[PDB]
Amino acid sequence: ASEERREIAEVNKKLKQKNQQLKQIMDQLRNLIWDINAMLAMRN
Amino acid sequence: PHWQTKLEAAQNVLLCKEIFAQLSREAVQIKSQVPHIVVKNQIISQPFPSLQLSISLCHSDHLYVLEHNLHLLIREFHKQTLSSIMMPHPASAPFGHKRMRLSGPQAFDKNEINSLQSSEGLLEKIIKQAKHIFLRSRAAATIDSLASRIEDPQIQAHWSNINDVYESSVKVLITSQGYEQICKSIQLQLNIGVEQIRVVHRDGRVITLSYQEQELQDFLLSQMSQHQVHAVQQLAKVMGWQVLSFSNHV
Amino acid sequence: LPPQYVDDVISRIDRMFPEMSIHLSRPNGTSAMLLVTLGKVLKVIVVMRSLFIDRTIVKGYNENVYTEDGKLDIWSKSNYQVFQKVTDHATTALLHYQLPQMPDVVVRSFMTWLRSYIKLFQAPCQRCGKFLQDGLPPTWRDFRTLEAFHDTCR
Amino acid sequence: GVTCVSQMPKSVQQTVELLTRKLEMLGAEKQGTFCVDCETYHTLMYVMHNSEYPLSCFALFENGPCLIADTNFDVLMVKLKGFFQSAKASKIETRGTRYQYCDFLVKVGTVTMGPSARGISVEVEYGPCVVASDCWSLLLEFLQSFLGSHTPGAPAVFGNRHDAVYGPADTMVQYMELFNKIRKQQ
Amino acid sequence: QKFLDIARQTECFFLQKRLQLSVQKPEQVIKEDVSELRNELQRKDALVQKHLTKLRHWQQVLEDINVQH
Amino acid sequence: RNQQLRTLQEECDRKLITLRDEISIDLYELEEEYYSSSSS
Ligand SMILES: [Zn+2]
């Protein structure tokens, strides 16, 4: 149905928008795990 | 204690002034195929064609992983003097780097001893790191971006939990839509070096790499088309179908 | 998996193969960095998280293993091409023995592979002579049939 | 690592260039110039000033205890000359051009009992492994390309223990044997 | 063992043949997509809740190690 | 005082590593989720 396809698009848009929230998390979580190791490995 | 915090700031400044002096002398005195530039308080340098290092003392963008490492890196340089390693375990002997004193009389080679003494000082130990901190980003963003751009197969990156400066370990598991079990296929361990990345392919092939972002993106795309072909082979193994002529490359 | 379980699995690994000796330092947090010595031929340092190995630096017996202290210093590669090639082969071969379902087999599967390396410098390859085009001896064991044909050999 | 020092005897000087040419066909970069020096004493004892170990001095006997000592060990000998007979007959020094080939560090130089230059010495030290005798099979096949039809069957310096460290020290024992043959004849 | 597979690879073939023919006229595969996408989002949010409480828990101890200095 | 200060640096590091350890397992499970995202 045409209307059903519209709801899927709305779900995809919400899921796609939620994915954008998720990608920033990894970059932040990734960045932190990067930074901690670089700071520590150099420890004296 | 108000007097305590006042003194601490002064001590930090005196140390900070030393750090820039150590970089500032090193940059112009020695050359490492890089055009360092000196300004009042900014030591501008170009480790990569697309990078600009603003190591700028600020008196009264900030990575804080490179910045902090300077403070700690200097101590290792300071520590190399007047350390416990210098002193000889045998009571009678001249002061010398313990590992060095046991190197000469234990017949170490011409190359290893020279390598140990060839420490690069300060600027090279940080430029090379910034030469890796962002090369990681260009290889990390591309992998992250490639997953969104291409939805047919799913790039998967399991990043290692121990990635010390001057190196980073990668996992790549290029699987199709949801067929992880039936179809597990080429997965390469990419290695982010200081100058160039290094991958080892699933089948056994080793590809050195280029340093530019574009070259990496091409490699993944080339491995993209390869997997879809491998999906045919895996289905042939598990489907009622039987194999015919194969052409892995061209 | 629990930190204690990691020690038991690797301690069990040492029992099967007499030549191999495993040292568990664990300098970093709950990520075993076992060190394996193959009798006298070669040494190796492998980092692993939660009993799933992800790296292998095959440093020869000659080369030093630590840097300035008990610090294992996994990164420093070998100064010889032969061990450098084995490093890539160990880096690549480690993957091919990964079974996502079971953590115990992958470690054991990798060790029998490493155990097959005790005979390096002494086994000709089935395809051509012991010594190949370049300056490397076999440096390539098949995953299932334990052959000796080189990197250039298939 | 593991080495097989040997000598491969008209046109002795031309032999090195021809022998180097055979090495050049395989392809090996000129990465330096090695210089091994031997010194001789009465009671005897030899101190082997070896290159690629700039610090080590490598004092040695015919068959007995060998110590590895830093460069300063020589200063003891010159100052200790009073109780010994220093520089008794002649010092044999062999200097040649280093040809390190894809981790084989194979070098060939003309041994010069200064200034005669009567012999040729081949250094085939194979860095990777210390285990040598139960690994000897590798070195031979590398040799067969370098030299022709007169490969040294075995260096004979290996006592064949159950577990065998070789290290660099026993190589200097091998060098001495080559020098002994050179000194004995012509 | 070989008889096992071929008779089974034939069995799924029949159902797989139905699937595409059953994809066309009904809306069920779209309906399953509605549920699967909804389930995927629900799992996503559940993972978040695991993240925040753990992240907040760490935020507390790190602050605690700071007030003690 | 040098003794008591060294303990604090070792103490915070020990807790600091555990933060990195727990983030590693937390990142790993999350990292898989993003790539698993279907149709987006
Ligand atoms: Zn071969």
From Swiss-Prot, chain B:
What's an example of a GO molecular-function annotation for this chain?
Answer: nuclear thyroid hormone receptor binding
GO-annotated biological processes: positive regulation of DNA-templated transcription; positive regulation of transcription by RNA polymerase II; positive regulation of transcription elongation by RNA polymerase II; positive regulation of transcription initiation by RNA polymerase II; protein ubiquitination; regulation of transcription by RNA polymerase II; RNA polymerase II preinitiation complex assembly; somatic stem cell population maintenance
Q: Does the keyword Transcription apply?
A: yes
What stretch or stretches form a coiled coil here?
Answer: none
Compartments (UniProt record): Nucleus
On tissue specificity, the annotation reads: Ubiquitous.
Q: Which keywords fit this entry according to its UniProt record?
A: Activator, Disease variant, Nucleus, Transcription, Transcription regulation
Kindly list the GO CC terms recorded for this protein.
core mediator complex; mediator complex; membrane; nucleoplasm; nucleus; transcription regulator complex; ubiquitin ligase complex
Q: Disease linkage in the record?
A: Microcephaly, postnatal progressive, with seizures and brain atrophy: A disorder characterized by postnatal progressive microcephaly and severe developmental retardation associated with cerebral and cerebellar atrophy. Infants manifest swallowing difficulties leading to failure to thrive, jitteriness, poor visual fixation, truncal arching, seizures. There is no acquisition of developmental milestones and patients suffer from marked spasticity and profound retardation. Progressive microcephaly becomes evident few months after birth.
Q: Which organism is it from?
A: Homo sapiens
Which gene name does the record give? MED17
Swiss-Prot record, chain D:
Q: Which GO terms describe its molecular function?
A: DNA-directed RNA polymerase activity; transcription coactivator activity
> GO cellular component annotations, sorted alphabetically?
core mediator complex; mediator complex; nucleoplasm; nucleus
Keywords, in A-Z order: Activator, Nucleus, Transcription, Transcription regulation
Instruction: Classify the source by domain of life.
Output: Eukaryota
- Coiled-coil positions: none
- List the subcellular locations: Nucleus
Keyword field contains Acetylation: no
Main localization category:
nucleus
Q: Name one GO biological process term.
A: positive regulation of transcription elongation by RNA polymerase II
Nucleus keyword on record: yes
- PANTHER family the record matches: MEDIATOR OF RNA POLYMERASE II TRANSCRIPTION SUBUNIT 20, UBIQUITIN SPECIFIC PROTEASE HOMOLOG 49
Subunit and partners:
Interacts with PPARG. Component of the Mediator complex, which is composed of MED1, MED4, MED6, MED7, MED8, MED9, MED10, MED11, MED12, MED13, MED13L, MED14, MED15, MED16, MED17, MED18, MED19, MED20, MED21, MED22, MED23, MED24, MED25, MED26, MED27, MED29, MED30, MED31, CCNC, CDK8 and CDC2L6/CDK11. The MED12, MED13, CCNC and CDK8 subunits form a distinct module termed the CDK8 module. Mediator containing the CDK8 module is less active than Mediator lacking this module in supporting transcriptional activation.
Protein family (similarity comment): Belongs to the Mediator complex subunit 20 family.
Protein name (record): Mediator of RNA polymerase II transcription subunit 20
> Which species does the entry assign this protein to?
Homo sapiens
Curated annotation (Swiss-Prot), chain E:
List this protein's GO terms for biological process.
negative regulation of smooth muscle cell differentiation; positive regulation of transcription elongation by RNA polymerase II; positive regulation of transcription initiation by RNA polymerase II; RNA polymerase II preinitiation complex assembly; somatic stem cell population maintenance
> A Gene Ontology molecular-function term?
actin binding
What are its GO cellular component terms? Answer: core mediator complex; cortical actin cytoskeleton; mediator complex; membrane; nucleoplasm; nucleus
Coiled coil located at which positions?
28-64
Q: In which tissues is it expressed?
A: Widely expressed. Highly expressed in vascular tissues such as placenta, testis and liver.
Q: Which domain of life is it from?
A: Eukaryota
Cellular localisation: Nucleus; Cytoplasm; Membrane
Q: What induces it?
A: Up-regulated by endothelial cells when exposed to tumor conditional media.
Q: Which UniProt keywords apply?
A: Actin-binding, Activator, Coiled coil, Cytoplasm, Membrane, Nucleus, Transcription, Transcription regulation
Which family does the UniProt entry place this protein in? Belongs to the Mediator complex subunit 28 family.
Q: What is this protein called?
A: Mediator of RNA polymerase II transcription subunit 28
Organism of origin: Homo sapiens
Species classification:
Eukaryota, Metazoa, Chordata, Craniata, Vertebrata
Curated annotation (Swiss-Prot), chain F:
Task: Could you list this entry's UniProt keywords, alphabetically sorted.
Answer: Activator, Coiled coil, Nucleus, Transcription, Transcription regulation
Q: Give coiled-coil spans as residue ranges.
A: 1-22
Q: Where in the cell is it found?
A: Nucleus
Residue ranges spanning the membrane: these are none
Q: Could you cite one Gene Ontology molecular function of this protein?
A: transcription coregulator activity
Does the UniProt entry include the keyword DNA damage?
A: no
One GO cellular component term noted in the UniProt record for this chain: nucleus
- The organism's place on the tree of life at top rank: Eukaryota
Gene Ontology terms describing biological process: positive regulation of transcription elongation by RNA polymerase II; positive regulation of transcription initiation by RNA polymerase II; RNA polymerase II preinitiation complex assembly
Tell me, in a sentence or two, what this protein's role is: Component of the Mediator complex, a coactivator involved in the regulated transcription of nearly all RNA polymerase II-dependent genes. Mediator functions as a bridge to convey information from gene-specific regulatory proteins to the basal RNA polymerase II transcription machinery. Mediator is recruited to promoters by direct interactions with regulatory proteins and serves as a scaffold for the assembly of a functional preinitiation complex with RNA polymerase II and the general transcription factors.
Family, per entry? Belongs to the Mediator complex subunit 22 family.
**Per its record, how is this protein called by name?**
Mediator of RNA polymerase II transcription subunit 22
Q: Which organism is it from?
A: Homo sapiens
